[PDB]
Design an enzyme around this catalytic site. Structure first.
Site, PDB file in Angstrom:
ATOM      1  N   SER A 178       0.888  -1.157   0.000  1.00  0.00           N
ATOM      2  CA  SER A 178       0.000   0.000   0.000  1.00  0.00           C
ATOM      3  C   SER A 178       0.921   1.201   0.000  1.00  0.00           C
ATOM      4  CB  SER A 178      -0.829   0.013   1.287  1.00  0.00           C
ATOM      5  OG  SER A 178      -1.559   1.228   1.380  1.00  0.00           O
TER       6      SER A 178
ATOM      7  N   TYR B 169      -2.035  -1.275  10.031  1.00  0.00           N
ATOM      8  CA  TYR B 169      -1.977  -1.502   8.603  1.00  0.00           C
ATOM      9  C   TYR B 169      -0.663  -0.987   7.996  1.00  0.00           C
ATOM     10  CZ  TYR B 169      -3.841  -1.587   3.802  1.00  0.00           C
ATOM     11  OH  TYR B 169      -4.112  -1.823   2.462  1.00  0.00           O
TER      12      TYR B 169
END
Ligand SMILES: NC(=O)c1ccc[n+]([C@@H]2O[C@H](COP(=O)([O-])OP(=O)(O)OC[C@H]3O[C@@H](n4cnc5c(N)ncnc54)[C@H](OP(=O)(O)O)[C@@H]3O)[C@@H](O)[C@H]2O)c1
Ligand SMILES: NC(=O)c1ccc[n+]([C@@H]2O[C@H](COP(=O)([O-])OP(=O)(O)OC[C@H]3O[C@@H](n4cnc5c(N)ncnc54)[C@H](OP(=O)(O)O)[C@@H]3O)[C@@H](O)[C@H]2O)c1
Lengths: 239, 239
Positions: free
Chosen positions: B147, B160
């Site tokens: 990401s 995350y």
């Protein structure tokens, strides 16, 4: 120079050995009120007593095993600190587990999980618990410990590399959230003469390495006033 | 073009929804023999049936809950694969948990640990179990999913961000260990129209986003022969 850290309250994890021990002792010599965290009670008692020899001030120590501590445990520790200390001016997260140094196909998954638990999860939980105390500082400094393999993964470094990458990411998130409130940075010590390094490199001559004492300038700088505008960065102790 | 992935056996995790579903379906359309991994049995059955509609070949699916699976569980899955498939030509680790998107002081530590367990630990354990099958390929391709917050941590991205940093580190370690044996790379999909993205950005207009179908070119390229010399890299699907 000797009063550089006067009236700064600095908590150091992994203060029972290696770099953390040296950091705690060095900060105390520069006038800091130090709080020692570790796992081994006898080692913590020894470090506290040696700090008392060197400074005539005996620091408090606390046991917190990062492998098994819960969020509640970290909160309880923070509560115990609050009783005796009105703030934290610095927190140095230095504790770490190396884990297996071997190919990915040979990494022990129990050890992998342990490395992630100590270096990342419990480091995060302790950070959460200590943040309110840090925010009471006039300019709190939160420091994480990385490694060269936390910037570029290399063969055999397995969970340790993954965990030090996570550490850089956690530091960056925190720096962004605490802009103009806290300084949040990483130190990469470089190869340093400790038991961890000797296990990672069993055939290397440890006399060729800098000692923890040698790499202290960066550790002092990040806790002192000359680093006050610096956040979100990773610094190499051996550039 | 339609036989680009003929006689390539490709395993896709998180194949039950979102990007993973699209990847599995896209690979099948290009001739691959696909193996679907997920958690939700009904969703996996649906994806397999839709692949059967589109290709007339019904892929096998396996349930593996990454939150709770053991190393033994991953090894058992690999054994089940070995029964029907002589190799794996590609493994796409696409499964992921977002966790809390909120300040570090509000991150739920149970959720933090879950994110690390699925995105990092179980992803590693599954990798270990599948490596022997991948090494049987003429040119095996192992792909992890990152990401933008796995390259630069930003406020609110908590576990995350830490987990996607760890993912980049794990990919780099593996690429270094498997030079001239495997291709090991990361894909960063960019903001993509899925349920995960919609939860992370509840007020954003999802029609402004590219769909999973839109970002497939990179997914195909990494499994096809034109990427054969490329390893250790992170690619943005939306540059
Ligand atoms: N030495 C190097 O070349 C090098 C290079 C790059 C980064 N580093 C980093 O430097 C930091 C310090 O390592 P070091 O080289 O000084 O190694 P070290 O001498 O072995 O010290 C590690 C410290 O971590 C603590 N620790 C380990 N597991 C713990 C646990 N479960 N709970 C609480 N504390 C735990 C240990 O405490 P106890 O003794 O009380 O068990 C010890 O005080 C680590 O983060 C390491 O990754 C070192
Ligand atoms: N969408 C984006 O904008 C975006 C951006 C950057 C990166 N990504 C990454 O893209 C990947 C796919 O996400 P997505 O956007 O497609 O989200 P998604 O539609 O919610 O799909 C996530 C997939 O992960 C699987 N998964 C979640 N927890 C699992 C568990 N415990 N055990 C096994 N599988 C589990 C889910 O399976 P079940 O449905 O069967 O539970 C689902 O198939 C993730 O790695 C995500 O981090 C997405």
């Amino acid at each position: 120079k000797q009063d550089l850290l006067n009236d700064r309250i600095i908590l150091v994890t992994g203060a029972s050995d290696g770099i953390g021990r040296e950091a705690a002792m060095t900060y105390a010599r520069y006038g800091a009120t130090v709080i020692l965290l570790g796992r081994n009670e006898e080692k913590l008692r020894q470090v506290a007593s040696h700090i008392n020899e060197e400074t005539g001030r005996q620091p408090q120590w606390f046991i917190l095993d990062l492998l098994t501590c819960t969020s509640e445990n970290c909160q309880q520790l923070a509560q115990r600190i609050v009783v005796n200390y009105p703030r934290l001016d610095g927190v140095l997260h230095n504790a770490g587990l190396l884990g297996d140094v071997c190919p990915m196909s040979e990494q022990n998954p129990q050890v992998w999980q342990d490395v992630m638990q100590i270096n990342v999860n419990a480091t995060f939980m302790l950070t959460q618990a200590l943040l309110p105390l840090l925010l009471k500082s006039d300019a709190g400094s939160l420091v994480f410990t990385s490694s060269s393999v936390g910037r570029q993964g290399r063969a055999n470094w397995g969970a340790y590399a993954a965990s030090k990458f996570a550490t850089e990411g956690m530091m960056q998130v925190l720096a962004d959230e605490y802009q103009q409130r806290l300084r949040v940075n990483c130190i990469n010590p470089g190869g340093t003469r400790t038991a961890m390094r000797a296990s990672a490199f069993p055939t290397e001559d440890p006399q060729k390495l800098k000692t923890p004492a040698d790499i202290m300038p960066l550790y002092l700088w990040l806790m002192g006033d000359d680093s006050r505008r610096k956040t979100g960065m990773t610094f190499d102790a051996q550039p």
